[PDB]
């Protein structure tokens, strides 16, 4: 009942152990350490009437539907019918008021002179202005940014096996679609666990890691719902969103309002297959590993996820997908 100083989120050796690891218009991500262990504190500037990065701010209800998937989607990991670890876990949210830290900024900069920024330098902020500071589990570095380093396809099954199950789940609980799924909102961390576990609807299962675990991020377009009360962002007066080239990643907004008829609250989990696809197509096409397929159970790999790609268009759900297709079996 009442938002709080940057301080209480952030004090002060968690301020200076931050560096920054992402952004967009919406929000910059920054890494840093509480006890010991790697966190990611997502801010977000709302409610004032200036533009940030070329856009006005987000109100509070604007804002809200995310944090509300974000919890939901986290929650998956502690539930016993459907059970995933594989949305970025969701530790703390906070309403924060106050300027920007100079600690923070002084991240800001870095990452500005080393990878560059589109963003606006976040200095104007005044002392009344409010933030919403989410804490999150640590997911590691986007499939993207890992583009040619990945050990081998066996990796990139592991990948697309992890996120159909995490999507499944997520289906099967809360009538799930991701929305956005393009290859920077796939997070790759490592793990020394051999086999990552999963329920759905009551069945349990396992996944070979290949040393990597997965975290799914980002709900700006994101659908579910909970005993009737449907929770999305209607996107049906968008054009923009519509009208971009270039990658494939395009096609598929296209592809989802065919699907659903532009009617956005509508439950259309074939929207989770075509980014499945997506992210396939990107395997296949874009990603290139340190060692190819050279040996008998590696080419078959290759075969297998090369039929993935030309098949799984014809299920309907990720659900479909997990429970019939043959590359998880
Ligand atoms: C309302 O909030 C809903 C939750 O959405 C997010 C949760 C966590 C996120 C990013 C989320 O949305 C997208 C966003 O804000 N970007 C700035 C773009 C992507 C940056 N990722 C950078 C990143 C690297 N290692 C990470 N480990 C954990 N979380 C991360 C990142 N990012």
Same mark, same amino acid.
């Given at each position: 009942?009442?938002?709080?100083?940057?301080?209480?989120?952030?004090?002060?050796?968690?301020?200076?152990?931050?560096?920054?690891?992402?952004?967009?218009?919406?929000?910059?991500?920054?890494?840093?350490?509480?006890?010991?262990?790697?966190?990611?504190?997502?801010?977000?500037?709302?409610?004032?009437?200036?533009?940030?990065?070329?856009?006005?701010?987000?109100?509070?209800?604007?804002?809200?539907?995310?944090?509300?998937?974000?919890?939901?989607?986290?929650?998956?990991?502690?539930?016993?019918?459907?059970?995933?670890?594989?949305?970025?876990?969701?530790?703390?949210?906070?309403?924060?008021?106050?300027?920007?830290?100079?600690?923070?900024?002084?991240?800001?900069?870095?990452?500005?002179?080393?990878?560059?920024?589109?963003?606006?330098?976040?200095?104007?902020?005044?002392?009344?202005?409010?933030?919403?500071?989410?804490?999150?589990?640590?997911?590691?570095?986007?499939?993207?940014?890992?583009?040619?380093?990945?050990?081998?396809?066996?990796?990139?099954?592991?990948?697309?096996?992890?996120?159909?199950?995490?999507?499944?789940?997520?289906?099967?609980?809360?009538?799930?679609?991701?929305?956005?799924?393009?290859?920077?909102?796939?997070?790759? &961390?490592?793990?020394?666990?051999?086999?990552?576990?999963?329920? !759905? @609807?009551?069945? %349990?299962? +396992?996944?070979?890691? *290949?040393?990597?675990?997965?975290?799914?991020?980002?709900?700006?377009?994101?659908?579910?719902?909970?005993?009737?009360?449907?929770?999305?962002?209607?996107?049906?007066?968008?054009?923009?969103?519509?009208?971009?080239?270039?990658?494939?990643?395009?096609?598929?907004?296209?592809?989802?309002?065919?699907?659903?008829?532009?009617?956005?609250?509508?439950?259309?989990?074939?929207?989770?297959?075509?980014?499945?696809?997506?992210?396939?197509?990107?395997?296949?096409?874009?990603?290139?590993?340190?060692?190819?397929?050279?040996?008998?159970?590696?080419?078959?790999? &290759?075969?297998?996820?090369?039929?993935?790609?030309?098949?799984? !268009? @014809?299920?309907? %759900?990720? +659900?479909?997908?997990? *429970?019939?297709?043959?590359?998880?079996?």
């Amino acid at each position: 009942k009442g938002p709080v100083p940057f301080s209480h989120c952030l004090p002060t050796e968690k301020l200076q152990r931050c560096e920054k690891i992402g952004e967009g218009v919406f929000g910059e991500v920054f890494q840093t350490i509480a006890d010991h262990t790697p966190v990611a504190i997502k801010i977000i500037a709302i409610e004032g009437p200036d533009l940030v990065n070329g856009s006005h701010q987000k109100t509070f209800e604007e804002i809200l539907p995310e944090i509300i998937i974000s919890k939901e989607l986290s929650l998956l990991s502690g539930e016993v019918c459907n059970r995933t670890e594989g949305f970025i876990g969701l530790n703390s949210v906070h309403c924060v008021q106050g300027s920007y830290p100079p600690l923070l900024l002084k991240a800001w900069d870095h990452y500005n002179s080393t990878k560059g920024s589109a963003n606006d330098r976040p200095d104007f902020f005044k002392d009344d202005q409010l933030f919403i500071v989410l804490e999150f589990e640590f997911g590691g570095i986007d499939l993207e940014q890992m583009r040619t380093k990945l050990s081998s396809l066996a990796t990139a099954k592991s990948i697309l096996h992890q996120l159909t199950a995490s999507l499944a789940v997520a289906e099967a609980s809360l009538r799930f679609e991701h929305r956005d799924l393009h290859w920077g909102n796939v997070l790759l &961390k490592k793990t020394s666990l051999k086999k990552l576990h999963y329920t !759905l @609807n009551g069945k %349990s299962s +396992t996944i070979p890691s *290949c040393g990597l675990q997965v975290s799914i991020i980002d709900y700006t377009l994101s659908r579910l719902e909970r005993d009737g009360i449907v929770v999305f962002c209607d996107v049906s007066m968008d054009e923009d969103l519509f009208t971009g080239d270039g990658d494939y990643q395009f096609d598929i907004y296209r592809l989802m309002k065919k699907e659903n008829n532009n009617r956005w609250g509508e439950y259309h989990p074939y929207s989770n297959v075509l980014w499945l696809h997506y992210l396939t197509d990107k395997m296949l096409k874009q990603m290139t590993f340190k060692t190819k397929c050279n040996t008998p159970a590696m080419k078959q790999i &290759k075969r297998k996820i090369q039929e993935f790609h030309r098949t799984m !268009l @014809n299920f309907s %759900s990720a +659900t479909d997908l997990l *429970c019939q297709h043959s590359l998880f079996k």
